[PDB]
């Protein structure tokens, strides 16, 4: 008689989900649509309010260096307030794996997103989704905000490196990172059902619903807009692929529709994504992305819990002021402002996400699984990314000339130079360690020098200098050189250099470097970036994208173990004036355009 259903494994997840909800308080009930940061996470914060959820923001660490088990640990001190809550309904923990698990030190990192659409390769993002879970699961950590299916219409957005594509079938083809992430659905599986495998795979997040990649110029943030058939054709059809693979959850965009903010549009979220798609997963706010429903933010909190709540929105990533947040909401429901069974369908969509992933039954992090963070099998798969990912754009100065690509790995003397030859911060870019990115060694990985050091011949010597004037190049009786350089980390808001020329010296390095000897330039950047004088100053010249921590995936294609296969998936313009200018625009005048790549061989 110490029986209760939803505690019963063996019960179908609907009737869990039913025999729990209705034992819940209101206080219960708002616990679960609480999601806050483990900043402000206690043991009683986590017990009292009966707390549905946590994430780690980015750079949210418990420390700088911590290991897998030391995220365990918290994780599981943080599971164990929530399982001796009266109901034990376990929270499920968050985080942005967006390249892999790139907020933990030894973690793999993965090219970004952009780098991926160039590998056309869907099945090699489903497995980066199988390696990733691994490593967050590595961490105890059970839910991942990926994957980003932005379609980035203007590469001036400094999250255009998290879009796959200006082109929207890319981005459709590249959800297989959801199976990879949760497992893949079984044979007779209703589209927009949430699932989850098991313990060894994590819950995604389809985010930004919806038109986050939307002009304009670049998308960081307007209403990211744009009308009708923008919508249901560009910005929207990834949601239903991602709907049909099963995705457990859709973060809501800061953007706005028609000048309705995404996070107050119940049209959209309620009518679209729940009653059209058919999702039955949760849905999930941005950060502070109700408090942005109302200008300035933050200035009338009110509305914005009932405005987000009245919306469609089930959980809200608070993250700091969760006392706010429970209170306001708890008096809307008490003065009959928002109804018990808005509440009830949010609770019964976040429980069936937890119940549907095993969440009950396994509650707390498997020490076991802490290896696979950082585990080289992962970084050889990351390694392949990479390689698949660079686009070789130029090959030769002139039709007559000898490709310089591959390179040999035996010769007397070589050169690396570049900004971005020794820099595993700047390969990897933004949302790495956090959440910007870093410049130096910030994690374990393989730098552009570190790994041609490791591929040639040991014969080779090899000279490094980060600016070398061009009379010392000239003097260095050297074969070739390979010369790095391109953007720094940034994001939406922070370092996003909207002219898209690369900072200095970048040019003047190549200029120098390849001024005095056949030069291979690698240009690491989240976009297409201002690239003539670049193109007429190399011998060879590849896009490298952000290749993340496995350096050695760029020399693979230099040195020809592996031939150049990646091709554009943004458009190259000519000009920063022309845009925006996508695929299919009226006056496509492109530098390169989408699709784009040279090849070579293997040698």
């Known amino acids: 008689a110490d029986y209760v259903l939803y505690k019963d494994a063996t019960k179908p997840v609907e009737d869990r989900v039913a025999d729990l909800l209705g034992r819940m308080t209101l206080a219960e009930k708002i616990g679960q649509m609480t999601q806050i940061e483990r900043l402000v996470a ?114 001036r957005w400094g999250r255009c490196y998290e879009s796959y594509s200006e082109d929207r079938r890319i981005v459709q083809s590249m959800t297989e990172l959801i199976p990879g992430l949760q497992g893949d659905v079984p044979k007779d599986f209703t589209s927009g059902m949430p699932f989850v495998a098991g313990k060894n795979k994590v819950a995604a997040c389809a985010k930004h619903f919806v038109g986050d990649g939307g002009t304009v110029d670049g998308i960081n943030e307007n209403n990211t807009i744009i009308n009708r058939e923008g919508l249901m054709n560009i910005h929207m059809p990834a949601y239903k692929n991602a709907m049909d693979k099963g995705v457990s959850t859709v973060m809501i965009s800061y953007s706005s529709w028609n000048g309705v903010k995404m996070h107050a549009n119940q049209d959209l979220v309620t009518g679209y994504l729940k009653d059209t798609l058919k999702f039955k997963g949760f849905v999930i706010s941005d950060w502070e992305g109700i408090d942005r429903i109302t200008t300035p933010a933050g200035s009338d909190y009110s509305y914005s819990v009932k405005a987000s709540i009245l919306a469609g929105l089930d959980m809200i990533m608070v993250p700091n002021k969760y006392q706010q947040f ?107 360690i956090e959440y910007q990115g870093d410049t130096g060694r910030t994690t374990v990985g393989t730098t552009i020098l570190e790994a041609v050091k490791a591929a040639v011949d040991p014969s080779t010597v090899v000279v490094f200098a980060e600016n070398p004037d061009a009379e010392f190049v000239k003097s260095g009786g050297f074969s070739y050189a390979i010369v790095a350089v391109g953007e720094h980390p940034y994001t939406e808001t922070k370092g996003d250099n909207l002219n898209l020329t690369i900072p200095e010296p970048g040019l003047s390095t190549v200029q120098a470097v390849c001024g005095g000897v056949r030069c291979a330039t690698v240009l690491i950047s989240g976009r297409p970036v201002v690239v003539q004088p670049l193109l007429a100053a190399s011998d060879a010249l590849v896009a490298a994208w952000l290749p993340g921590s496995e350096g050695q995936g760029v020399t693979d294609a230099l ?45």
């Open 326 to 432: 429970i209170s306001i909401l708890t008096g809307h429901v008490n003065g009959g402002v928002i109804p018990m069974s808005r509440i009830d369908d949010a609770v019964t969509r976040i429980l069936r996400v937890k119940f549907t992933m095993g969440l009950f039954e396994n509650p707390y992090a498997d020490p076991a699984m802490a290896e696979q963070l950082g585990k080289q099998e992962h970084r050889d798969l990351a390694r392949e990314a990479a390689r698949k990912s660079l686009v070789l754009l130029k090959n030769g100065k002139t039709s007559t000339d000898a490709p310089l690509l591959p390179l040999p790995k035996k010769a007397p003397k070589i050169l690396v130079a570049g900004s971005h030859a020794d820099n595993l911060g700047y390969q990897c870019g933004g949302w790495t």
């Open 42 to 155: 206690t043991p009683d914060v986590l017990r009292d309010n009966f707390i549905g959820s946590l994430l780690s923001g980015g750079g949210s660490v418990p420390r700088k260096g911590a290991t897998a088990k030391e995220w365990q640990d918290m994780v599981d001190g943080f599971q164990k307030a929530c399982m001796s809550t009266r109901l034990g309904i376990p929270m499920i923990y968050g985080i942005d794996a967006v390249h892999g698990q790139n907020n933990v030190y030894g973690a793999t990192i993965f090219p970004h997103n952009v780098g991926l659409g160039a590998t056309r390769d869907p099945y090699l993002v489903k497995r980066i989704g199988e390696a990733t879970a691994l490593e967050v699961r590595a961490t105890g950590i059970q839910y991942a905000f990926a994957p980003c299916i932005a379609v980035c219409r203007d590469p």
């Open 559 to 603: 040195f020809g173990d592996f031939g150049f296969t990646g091709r554009l998936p943004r458009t190259w313009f000519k000009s920063v004036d022309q845009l925006p200018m996508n695929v299919g625009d009226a006056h496509y005048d492109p530098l390169f355009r989408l699709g784009y790549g040279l090849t070579t061989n293997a040698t």
